[PDB]
Structure formats: structure tokens, C-alpha cells
Amino acid sequence: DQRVSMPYASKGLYLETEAGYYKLSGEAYGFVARIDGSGNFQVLLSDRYFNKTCGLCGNFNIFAEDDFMTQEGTLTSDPYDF
């Protein structure tokens, strides 16, 4: 809840600005998030989580049709209740 300044580097998470746009790097944990001026979230994520992750950005597999596997595990046709 405490507002901190920026940059910031605690716990292996460097919270920087790159190219006028804000970045949150976690290379120890395997991810690089960022936001632009308009507001457009982006998540670059390593191949270590191939077949492993699941969430609102889908699993990191090769296929693109099966990547709505709900928190139970259910291939749903709807992109919304997912």
C-alpha cells in the first residue's frame, strides 16, 4: 500500500523505464512485463514454461485452438466465461 518512487529494484524485480515506456523485468523468474503511454499490457515469457502455464493469456504450447483450458481444466468454445 505504500507508494514508492521509480526506478525500483527490490527482490530481483527491476522496475525501470525503457524508451519512454515502463518496464518490469523479472529475468530471475522468467518474465518481462511493460506498459506503453496509451496503456497496452505486454508479457514476454520464457520457454521454461512451455506446456506449463495457464491463465488469461493461455498456455504456451504450439497450438492456438486449445488454449482456453479453464481453472478446472475444460476446453471451452466461449472466449468469455473462460
Partner 1 sequence: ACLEGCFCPPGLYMDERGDCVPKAQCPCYYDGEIFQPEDIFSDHHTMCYCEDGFMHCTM
Ligand X SMILES: *[C@@H]1O[C@H](CO)[C@@H](O)[C@H](O)[C@H]1NC(C)=O
Residues making contact with partner 1 (CB under 8 A): 70, 72, 74, 76
Q: Select the residue whose beta carbon is closest to ligand X and give its number.
A: 51
Give the number of residues in contact with ligand X, rule: CB under 6 A: 2
Nearer to partner 1, 41 or 80 (CB): 80
Write out the three cell numbers for 71. 481453472
11 conformational bin, left if phi > 0, alpha if psi -120 to 50, beta if neither: left
β-pairing verdict for 21-25 and 31-35? antiparallel
Contact of residue 51 among ligand X, Ca ion, partner 1, none (CB under 5-8 Å per partner type): ligand X
Cis peptide before 79 (omega within 30 of 0): no
Can residue 76 be called a binding residue for ligand X (CB under 6 A)?
Answer: no
Question: Which residues contribute to the site for ligand X (CB under 6 A)?
Answer: 51, 61
